[PDB]
Amino acid sequence: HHMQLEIQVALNFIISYLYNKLPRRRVNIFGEELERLLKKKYEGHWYPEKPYKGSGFRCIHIGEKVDPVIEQASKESGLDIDDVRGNLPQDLSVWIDPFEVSYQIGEKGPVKVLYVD
Ligand SMILES: O=c1[nH]c2ccccc2n2cccc12
């Protein structure tokens, strides 16, 4: 029902990797904190008019370095960011733009779409 809905889509996707190698309730906590941090980060950086404006800011990147929002959601969930990294596909990008959520795996991977309207 917003940028909200789209952060949900990305969240669901990301944590989907984490369940069943990381403890259930603490992955739930990881999601909830992730959701909060994205909202807090994306506030005022969301322009349905120019969806691509700030797209590179909003991008969740987990290459050889981890996006702070990921690192923060880990610390606030008691999870070792190395164990979280480990269960997430390497060189992952998730772009969350108005009307579209998409992601790439691997430097030469195709972009895939989770949500578009
Ligand atoms: O890995 C990146 N993907 C990306 C996708 C769309 C827009 C901007 C970016 N971007 C900006 C710094 C880094 C990245």
C-alpha 102 – ligand 1 centre gap (Å): 12
Q: Which residues pair with 104 in a beta bridge?
A: 93, 111
- Give φ, ψ of 92 to 5 degrees: -90, 140
Within 13 Å, how many C-alpha atoms sit on residue 30's CB side? Answer: 26
| Entry resolution (Å) | 2.3
Give which of 47, 46, 62, 68 is closest to 94, Cα–Cα: 62
Residue with the nearest Cα to atom 14 of ligand 1? 56
Distance CA 4, CA 87 (A): 25
Contacts of 7 (CB under 8 A, 6+ apart): 35, 38, 39, 42, 96
Listed by start position, the domains of the chain span 1-117
C-alpha 100 – ligand 1 centre gap (Å): 14
Helices (H), 17-58: 24-42
Q: Ligand 1, from 50, 67, 93: best to mutate by most atoms within 8 Å of Cβ?
A: 93
Indicate which technique resolved this structure. X-ray
Q: The domain 1-117 is classified under which CATH number: 3.30.565.10, 3.40.640.10, 3.40.718.10, 3.90.640.90?
A: 3.90.640.90
Contacts of 99 (CB under 8 A, 6+ apart): 48, 51, 116, 117
111-116: strand order across its sheet: 60-62, 92-97, 100-105, 111-116
